[PDB]
């Protein structure tokens, strides 16, 4: 009645279903995130900060003593499972139980994007290495390389006096690191737990199936990312662009920032088109910012 | 000046260093535990789970299950010594060679002052619970079910801002010693002796420093006790009764017998009438010359 052949065939069918569902799932975090695989509990990120530069070597070779502080990514774990109910063995009604595996593949493929974009939206409620919010009006900027003396207040969060509108983000991808980092301790894996001599199977009436994964997402350095709840207009976009591109490191030296793409929800696609991607301005003159940035509309931002 | 001479010198120095570091009078081993680590940080699970056994059968009947974690964040230490400007090629190496065995002895006892640094500053270190180590809200479990209810008591003794010296009562019978000692690499010996080396052309002070990585942490909070009030026979008996009366979940006795006592040198007078006289103190009057004999350390 029960032989290894049938169990193997069903396991292969379920594995094929799940793998097909997951492989074709869209990937979007890679564009605005950096993947850093690891083989431990966490990774230390103390190199984010100062911008490396070149000196004239007037005297001796300067050696940088890196700070001992770390970001403490502290990756996490999470997963989901179902059962089969064993109903198929008797009647072989295998038509059902497909959409469940498809849903698993979709969820596994799409979760990292959801987490990355949720962290991106939560920048106003997450602390960076500076000890303050990611989008804050009092970021630390010292006047000396050693990092001492009175600092200056820099703000990259803009909001009208009241009734703030939709929120749009401006990011950069030219650098090696994207503003957000998506860790990956282990790729998601599925376990075809179905045995006749196992337990909670003979005493229950289910063939449980589960998936496992380990990953987490964290912020990078705020020099690039910018946020603004202002209405997406030419003047506001130009102000944000020129404020971000005019960033100076310690000692008032420009960083040569090159904003690449601007992220808006699917609701503001029309405004993104009007600002960039069309040859008509509001007044009807030729754009001075045509195809300047590559817009990336997404549903994860509503 | 040949490579064979360098090899022989390195072998002799290695033998001298290995001779020490082994017979040093270590005192941390009484209250610390040796643990082989592999990474830069080690997390923890349970923090107050007394391992005990129950009548029921199976191997799955009762257990506490772990809670939020506690990291060590292993630190680093180093020593260094060497004066060979005139020792080498002068037959003066007979000295500068046996004197550093004391350096090895002293360095091998460093975990002692590390654990005592943790011990002295136990009130300024964050505990996994959230409050100070010696707080008055230490959770106690009435039953084994999730987080049912955490009652507490004034665990330790402290008067109304009365002057005194802090003396600690410790136990070491259980291998779950109150402190922890995590080491990543054992002490290592490095030889930079290289003929006509670029940076060691300077006379012949051949650097012979060492490298080590280790740290210490907190284990059980109940295994340790503190007292800043005036040291007296009545107060000593009170402290001993309070510590021995400690009971875990379910009211099952613990049999915890205190073994170690730490006192500053200033309180040494009282710590000597308490221990060492069988006539009037810890003797005729409240005889208590049996347990927790004072050790009277001075690294605090």
CB-based contact B229:B164 (threshold 8 Å): yes
B43 in contact with A, Cβ within 8 Å: yes
Q: Do B39 and A44 touch (CB under 8 A)?
A: no
For B43, the closest chain A residue by CA position comes to A41
Does the CB of B68 have a partner CB in chain A at under 8 Å?
A: no
3-state DSSP call for residue B75? strand
d(C-alpha A135, C-alpha A121), whole Å: 10
Cα distance between residue A248 and residue A232, in whole Å: 25
The candidate with the shortest Cα–Cα distance to A19, out of A115, A123, A113, A105, is A105
Chain A CB within 8 Å of residue B76 CB: no
User: Any chain B CB within 8 A of the CB of A8?
Assistant: no
Residue B39 forms contact with A (CB below 8 Å): yes
Instruction: Give the separation between CA B218 and CA B120, rounded to whole angstroms.
Output: 12
Contacts of residue B41 in chain A, CB cutoff 8 Å? 41-42
- Dig out the tokens for A241 from the structure: 């662009």
Q: Judged by CB atoms within 8 Å, which residues 89-148 of A form the interface with B?
A: none
Longest dimension (CA), chain B: 76
Q: Is A194 on the interface with B (CB under 8 A)?
A: no
> Do A92 and A85 touch, CB atoms closer than 8 A?
no
The residue written with tokens 């449980």 in the block is A208
In this structure, are strands A226-228 and A157-158 parallel, antiparallel, or unpaired? Answer: parallel
Nearest residue on chain B to A43, judged by CA atoms? B40
> Resolution of this entry in Å?
4.0
How far is it, in rounded angstroms, from Cα A177 to Cα A32? 9
Token pair for residue B50?
């007394």
Does B39 contact A41 at a Cβ distance shorter than 8 Å?
Answer: yes
- What distance in Å separates the CA atoms of residue A149 and residue B297, rounded to the nearest whole number? 43
β-bridge mates for residue B261, sequence order? B169, B294
Q: Determine contact, residues B287/B255, Cβ cutoff 8 Å.
A: no
Q: What is the 3-state secondary structure (H, E, C) of A200-254?
A: CCCCCCCCCEEEEEEEEEEECCCCCCEEECCCCCHHHHHHHHHHHHCCEECCCEE
Rounded (10°) angle between helices A98-121 and A4-23: 40
Region label for A26, one of left (φ > 0), alpha (ψ between -120 and 50) or beta (otherwise) = beta
| DSSP 8-state assignment for residue A19 | H
Residues in chain B with CB shorter than 8 Å from the CB of A42 are: 41
Size of interface A-B (CB pairs under 8 A): 6
């Amino acid at each position: 009645i029960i032989t290894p052949a049938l169990i193997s065939a069903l396991k292969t069918s379920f594995q094929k279903h799940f793998q097909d569902a997951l492989a074709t799932a869209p990937s979007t975090y890679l564009q605005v995130a950096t993947v850093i695989p690891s083989t431990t509990a966490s990774n230390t990120y103390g190199w984010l900060g100062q911008f490396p530069k070149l000196r004239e070597w007037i005297g001796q070779r300067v050696i940088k003593d890196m700070a001992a502080q770390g970001y403490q990514i502290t990756n996490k774990l999470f997963e989901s499972t179902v059962g089969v109910k064993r109903t198929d063995i008797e009647d072989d009604n295998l038509g059902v139980y497909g959409p469940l595996m498809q849903e698993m593949g979709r969820a596994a493929g799409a979760h990292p994007d959801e987490l990355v974009f949720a962290l991106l939206k939560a920048g106003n409620a997450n602390l960076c290495y500076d000890g303050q919010n990611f989008f804050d009006t009092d970021h630390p900027v010292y006047p000396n390389v050693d990092g001492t003396g009175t600092a200056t207040t820099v703000s990259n969060l803009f909001a009208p006096a009241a009734d703030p509108g939709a929120a749009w983000y401006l990011l950069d991808t030219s650098r090696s690191l994207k503003p957000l980092i998506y860790q990956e301790r282990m790729k998601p894996s599925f376990t075809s737990m179905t045995k006749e001599d196992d337990e909670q199977v003979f005493m229950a009436d289910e063939y449980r199936y589960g998936v496992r994964s380990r990953c987490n997402v964290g912020f990078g350095f705020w020099q690039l990312a910018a946020m603004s709840t202002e209405e997406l207009n030419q003047v506001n976009f130009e102000k944000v662009y020129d404020a971000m591109r005019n960033q100076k490191a310690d000692g008032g030296r420009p960083l040569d920032i090159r904003p690449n793409l601007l992220v808006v929800p699917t609701t503001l696609r029309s405004k993104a088109k009007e600002v960039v991607g069309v040859q008509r301005l509001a007044n009807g003159a030729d754009n001075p910012n045509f195809e300047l940035v590559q817009v990336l509309d997404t549903a994860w931002l509503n």
